[PDB]
Amino acid sequence: MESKVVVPAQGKKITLQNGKLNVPENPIIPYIEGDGIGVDVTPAMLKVVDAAVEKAYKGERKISWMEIYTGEKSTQVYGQDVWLPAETLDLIREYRVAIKGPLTTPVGGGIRSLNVALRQELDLYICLRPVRYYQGTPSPVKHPELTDMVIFRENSEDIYAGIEWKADSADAEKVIKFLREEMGVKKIRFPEHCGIGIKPCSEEGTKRLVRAAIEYAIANDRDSVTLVHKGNIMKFTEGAFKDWGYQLAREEFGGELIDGGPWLKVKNPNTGKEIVIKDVIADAFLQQILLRPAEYDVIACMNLNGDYISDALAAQVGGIGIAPGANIGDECALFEATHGTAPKYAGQDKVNPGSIILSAEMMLRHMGWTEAADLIVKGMEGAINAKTVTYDFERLMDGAKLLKCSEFGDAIIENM
Amino acid sequence: MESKVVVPAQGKKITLQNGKLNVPENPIIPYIEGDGIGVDVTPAMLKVVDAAVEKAYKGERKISWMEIYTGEKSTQVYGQDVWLPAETLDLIREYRVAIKGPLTTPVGGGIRSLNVALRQELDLYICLRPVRYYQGTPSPVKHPELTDMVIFRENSEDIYAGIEWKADSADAEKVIKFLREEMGVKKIRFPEHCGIGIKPCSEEGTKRLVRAAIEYAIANDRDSVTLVHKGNIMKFTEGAFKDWGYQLAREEFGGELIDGGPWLKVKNPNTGKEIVIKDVIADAFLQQILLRPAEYDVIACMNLNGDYISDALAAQVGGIGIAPGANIGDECALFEATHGTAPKYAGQDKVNPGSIILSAEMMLRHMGWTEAADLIVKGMEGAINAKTVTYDFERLMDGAKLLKCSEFGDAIIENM
Ligand SMILES: [Mg+2]
Numbered sequence: 001m002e003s004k005v006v007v008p009a010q011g012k013k014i015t016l017q018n019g020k021l022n023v024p025e026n027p028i029i030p031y032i033e034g035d036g037i038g039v040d041v042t043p044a045m046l047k048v049v050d051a052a053v054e055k056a057y058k059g060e061r062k063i064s065w066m067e068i069y070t071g072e073k074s075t076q077v078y079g080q081d082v083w084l085p086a087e088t089l090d091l092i093r094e095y096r097v098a099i100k101g102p103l104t105t106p107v108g109g110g111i112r113s114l115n116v117a118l119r120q121e122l123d124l125y126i127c128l129r130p131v132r133y134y135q136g137t138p139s140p141v142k143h144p145e146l147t148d149m150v151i152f153r154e155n156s157e158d159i160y161a162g163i164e165w166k167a168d169s170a171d172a173e174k175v176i177k178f179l180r181e182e183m184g185v186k187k188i189r190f191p192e193h194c195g196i197g198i199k200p201c202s203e204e205g206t207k208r209l210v211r212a213a214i215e216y217a218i219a220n221d222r223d224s225v226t227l228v229h230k231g232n233i234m235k236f237t238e239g240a241f242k243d244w245g246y247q248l249a250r251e252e253f254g255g256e257l258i259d260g261g262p263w264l265k266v267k268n269p270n271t272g273k274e275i276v277i278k279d280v281i282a283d284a285f286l287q288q289i290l291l292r293p294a295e296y297d298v299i300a301c302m303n304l305n306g307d308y309i310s311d312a313l314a315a316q317v318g319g320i321g322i323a324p325g326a327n328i329g330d331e332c333a334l335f336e337a338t339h340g341t342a343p344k345y346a347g348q349d350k351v352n353p354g355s356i357i358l359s360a361e362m363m364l365r366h367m368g369w370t371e372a373a374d375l376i377v378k379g380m381e382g383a384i385n386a387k388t389v390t391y392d393f394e395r396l397m398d399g400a401k402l403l404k405c406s407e408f409g410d411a412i413i414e415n416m
Numbered sequence: 417m418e419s420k421v422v423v424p425a426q427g428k429k430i431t432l433q434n435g436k437l438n439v440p441e442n443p444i445i446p447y448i449e450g451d452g453i454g455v456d457v458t459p460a461m462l463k464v465v466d467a468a469v470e471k472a473y474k475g476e477r478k479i480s481w482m483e484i485y486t487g488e489k490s491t492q493v494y495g496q497d498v499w500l501p502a503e504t505l506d507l508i509r510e511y512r513v514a515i516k517g518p519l520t521t522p523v524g525g526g527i528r529s530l531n532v533a534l535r536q537e538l539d540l541y542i543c544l545r546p547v548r549y550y551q552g553t554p555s556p557v558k559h560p561e562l563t564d565m566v567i568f569r570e571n572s573e574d575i576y577a578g579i580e581w582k583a584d585s586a587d588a589e590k591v592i593k594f595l596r597e598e599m600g601v602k603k604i605r606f607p608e609h610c611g612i613g614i615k616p617c618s619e620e621g622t623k624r625l626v627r628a629a630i631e632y633a634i635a636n637d638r639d640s641v642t643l644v645h646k647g648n649i650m651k652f653t654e655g656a657f658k659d660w661g662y663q664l665a666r667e668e669f670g671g672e673l674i675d676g677g678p679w680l681k682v683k684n685p686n687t688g689k690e691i692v693i694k695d696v697i698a699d700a701f702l703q704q705i706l707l708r709p710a711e712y713d714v715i716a717c718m719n720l721n722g723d724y725i726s727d728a729l730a731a732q733v734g735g736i737g738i739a740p741g742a743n744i745g746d747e748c749a750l751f752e753a754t755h756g757t758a759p760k761y762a763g764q765d766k767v768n769p770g771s772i773i774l775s776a777e778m779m780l781r782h783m784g785w786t787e788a789a790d791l792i793v794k795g796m797e798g799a800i801n802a803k804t805v806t807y808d809f810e811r812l813m814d815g816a817k818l819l820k821c822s823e824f825g826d827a828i829i830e831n832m
């Protein structure tokens with residue numbers, strides 16, 4: 001079968017030279033519509049982004065959107081069982097920057113998360129999830145405005161590697177035999193009818209993630225980088241991550257001991273600000289983000305903890321449905337709606353397009369088109385403050401004007 | 417060296433017959449003082465518990481406390497490097513019910529968590545952490561009163577098994593070689609300078625935990641049991657836990673499909689109430705406890721997720737320092753202060769003894785001395801409502817009378 005992707009007539013491919021993006025005034029940007037409500041949120045995103053771009057650069061710049069496939073629609077386009085075409089992986093890497101709506105993975109076919117598949121296949125080792133409060137957002141906590149963090153979640157290793165064997169399977173038995181007999185393992189409480197999973201954490205995987213986190217704090221003049229881990233129980237994976245992260249701060253960024261330790265100060269080479277590098281045990285951290293959110297800023301953590309932390313933080317600022325996210329690697333980046341596919345509402349034009357729209361904001365910023373990105377943030381802030389919102393917000397507040405998904409995209413534009 | 421434990425002259429040992437505790441009117445109860453602030457909170461607990469017992473049973477019953485050791489004090493008593501004497505394990509199992517202050521594990525000697533050691537050595541497979549709101553407690557959320565859950569955290573397996581090898585170690589290389597060469601593993605992103613951890617989840621470990629959770633919901637007429645897991649990524653450990661938990665509900669408790677699934681209804685054989693058995697993915701759950709706390713009740717989950725969930729829930733109800741906890745097995749039980757040792761305040765009589773006191777409440781209830789247990793809850797409720805509290809609470813409120821740790825124990829008694 002031939003590619004069903006149509007490369008835009010007008011439009012030029014973004015290139016990368018010396019680790020820096022070279023973006024034309026007419027970049028071709030691949031986008032995956034997304035399953036379920038992607039059908040509602042993606043069009044709203046396309047419209048909002050084009051407006052921000054038009055408004056910021058007076059027509060001098062324009063994105064040439066190119067639809068690519070993954071998920072249910074992909075099976076619809078490329079046929080039964082083509083959930084993630086090789087061409088989509090090729091195209092994202094080729095065009096450098098892309099965006100996607102939500103995706104779901106089918107059950108019953110032994111297929112692993114398509115979202116994780118994209119991340120791992122493309123080596124997008126940074127899952128970047130910034131979490132801030134938008135004034136006017138109905139929140140479950142008393143002071144959501146104190147929350148302004150940026151999560152750098154390691155995206156290529158940890159238990160997400162997908163290395164595991166089913167209880168009673170011959171492989172699981174093989175692995176357990178090896179562990180008990182050759183490794184001398186005596187700690188498996190119940191070796192029978194036992195599932196086994198492997199959790200890897202490497203020096204290189206950890207340092208490239210933390211390096212990106214510290215560079216981000218420097219580039220954005222943030223106040224601190226917190227290494228979140230459960231190293232007191234998992235000494236060689238989680239504790240190693242913490243150790244390697246502080247070691248990198250010291251080796252590459254001149255981090256030096258604060259008082260008697262364990263924290264370090266890294267001087268911002270551009271503002272002279274001293275960035276604090278510290279660490280918090282993961283369970284305690286889930287308490288600290290609620291109790292002393294003002295003390296945290298950039299967070300660097302492993303894959304699973306980051307999955308939990310980003311979800312917990314989004315919920316607390318009332319942002320469960322408008323949380324932006326990006327998956328960034330050294331050769332390309334994939335921005336994404338971070339919520340689910342909500343099939344019950346799909347096609348109804350009712351869900352909140354705020355998440356994919358703020359992911360588009362991150363995308364534009366990544367492309368260096370910061371004026372367009374600032375217009376989207378400004379639009380999002382005014383629409384929400386205007387209390388002209390979608391049902392998920394409206395139902396939690398008084399005096400709100402209920403808007404459809406499409407209408408909220410307009411409201412964002414009306415507020416740029 | 418001879419035991420330094422002194423068995424109480426008066427006092428009788430609790431026995432177990434047919435899985436049911438036989439508690440004398442003069443039970444001997446072992447207690448570990450605890451490191452750091454254990455020095456402050458344990459005496460307050462001893463006094464409060466004796467008062468509740470005296471008041472409820474008019475002198476007919478009385479606990480004969482027996483001090484046993486673990487932690488820093490143990491090295492002080494039994495000598496260098498005796499952090500957890502074998503006799504403490506023997507005594508807890510022998511006397512069936514015990515309580516402990518906080519403990520910390522030394523770093524630099526390759527010693528694993530002493531708290532986890534106790535749990536695993538004694539096969540206390542249930543970590544029971546109930547979380548409710550006490551009116552008057554300063555909380556970070558708007559509606560903490562909506563939170564009333566009971567966490568059944570699996571305590572014997574998961575990554576807590578302590579099976580791992582250090583990056584670059586010969587064993588780690590040995591394990592990785594085996595994985596790639598004999599198991600055909602290709603998913604380790606960076607096989608060099610790579611730490612490896614093993615995560616086991618068995619049918620028997622999962623079912624005994626979930627069985628206890630469902631029996632608790634029945635015995636206490638709770639509304640539902642939620643299986644929390646990240647089975648969409650960890651199919652054979654976390655997904656297996658979810659599958660085995662629903663299977664047990666069906667096989668042993670007559671659970672039957674609700675609507676089209678996946679939830680089940682289990683009829684309370686004593687109240688005829690239908691208990692809902694459902695499940696939520698772990699990251700989403702950390703959002704749900706904040707956003708729709710009223711929809712959750714008894715929670716059954718694996719070791720690590722339970723560590724996170726219990727911490728997150730305690731923080732949200734303003735209970736970070738008064739959260740009770742118990743470690744229960746088939747032959748004995750160990751109740752515990754659930755906070756840290758806070759050495760900076762140790763010996764100052766200033767920290768909140770509420771956690772170990774509410775763990776003592778759970779202890780008394782476990783012994784079937786529910787009247788005494790109800791007196792402690794009543795005392796805790798009146799002291800907190802009276803705004804006569806320790807600094808950790810007082811500093812967060814207006815119009816509070818600041819009390820020392822010892823004085824707050826009195827306030828609890830004054831309110832029984
Ligand atoms: Mg997630």
Ligand SMILES: [Mg+2]
Binds near residue numbers: 727
């Ligand atoms: Mg914990």
